[PDB]
């Protein structure tokens, strides 16, 4: 249920505390807070940015 | 112009939401109905919808 | 219509804008805002305007 809660945190081949049921749904990265309020969609594109003179506002380069 | 219309549209109407949605569904119909009638590639059904709701309707 | 003789740069355009706003659409304003940034630039350029350790006067 919850590693590391009370007795001695289990540490397997991962050479570190394992990942109990609780904690995969907790923290900053509990399921909640990151796959769930914050998922990671497609239909996207990033880039650097640069002033787009000539191109007016309400427009973007692309 | 469409721009000023888009403005006037919601410069004197119901909840800016309330509008939209009905702009929306409208166009939805504007697309569903008249499905690919005039190509519309330029005047997106949404655009239509707007003008025919921001000038025609007004 | 209100002609305004004043040195415009920061704030002068700020409230301007608003003013516009209220009194006209957004849409317009925007397109104002634009045209004028556009000034902004080109004049700026035209002035040509550089700085330097010397430009750093000393009092």
Swiss-Prot record, chain A:
Q: Which domain of life is it from?
A: Bacteria
Its subunit composition reads:
In cyanobacteria the RNAP catalytic core is composed of 2 alpha, 1 beta, 1 beta', 1 gamma and 1 omega subunit. When a sigma factor is associated with the core the holoenzyme is formed, which can initiate transcription.
What function does the entry list? DNA-dependent RNA polymerase catalyzes the transcription of DNA into RNA using the four ribonucleoside triphosphates as substrates.
Question: Per the similarity annotation, which family is this?
Answer: Belongs to the RNA polymerase beta' chain family. RpoC1 subfamily.
Q: What is this protein called?
A: DNA-directed RNA polymerase subunit gamma
Q: Which organism is it from?
A: Nostoc sp. (strain PCC 7120 / SAG 25.82 / UTEX 2576)
Curated annotation (Swiss-Prot), chain B:
Which UniProt key words apply to this protein?
DNA-directed RNA polymerase, Nucleotidyltransferase, Transcription, Transferase
Superkingdom to which the source organism belongs: Bacteria
Entry keyword annotation includes Transcription = yes
Any single GO CC term annotated in Swiss-Prot or TrEMBL for this entry = DNA-directed RNA polymerase complex
Q: EC number(s)?
A: 2.7.7.6
Could you tell me the Gene Ontology terms of the biological process aspect for this record?
Answer: DNA-templated transcription
Its recorded reaction(s) are:
RNA(n) + a ribonucleoside 5'-triphosphate = RNA(n+1) + diphosphate
The record describes its quaternary structure and partners as: In cyanobacteria the RNAP catalytic core is composed of 2 alpha, 1 beta, 1 beta', 1 gamma and 1 omega subunit. When a sigma factor is associated with the core the holoenzyme is formed, which can initiate transcription.
* Family (UniProt): Belongs to the RNA polymerase subunit omega family.
Protein's UniProt name? DNA-directed RNA polymerase subunit omega
According to its UniProt entry, this protein's organism is Nostoc sp. (strain PCC 7120 / SAG 25.82 / UTEX 2576)
Q: What is the lineage of its organism?
A: Bacteria, Bacillati, Cyanobacteriota, Cyanophyceae, Nostocales
Curated annotation (Swiss-Prot), chain C:
Stretches of the chain forming a coiled coil according to its record: none
Superkingdom field? Bacteria
Quaternary structure, per UniProt, is: In cyanobacteria the RNAP catalytic core is composed of 2 alpha, 1 beta, 1 beta', 1 gamma and 1 omega subunit. When a sigma factor is associated with the core the holoenzyme is formed, which can initiate transcription.
What function does the entry list?
Answer: DNA-dependent RNA polymerase catalyzes the transcription of DNA into RNA using the four ribonucleoside triphosphates as substrates.
Q: Which family does it belong to?
A: Belongs to the RNA polymerase beta' chain family. RpoC2 subfamily.
Name of the molecule in the record: DNA-directed RNA polymerase subunit beta'
- Species source reads Nostoc sp. (strain PCC 7120 / SAG 25.82 / UTEX 2576)
Relative to the complete UniProt sequence, the shown stretch is 6 to 64 of 1355
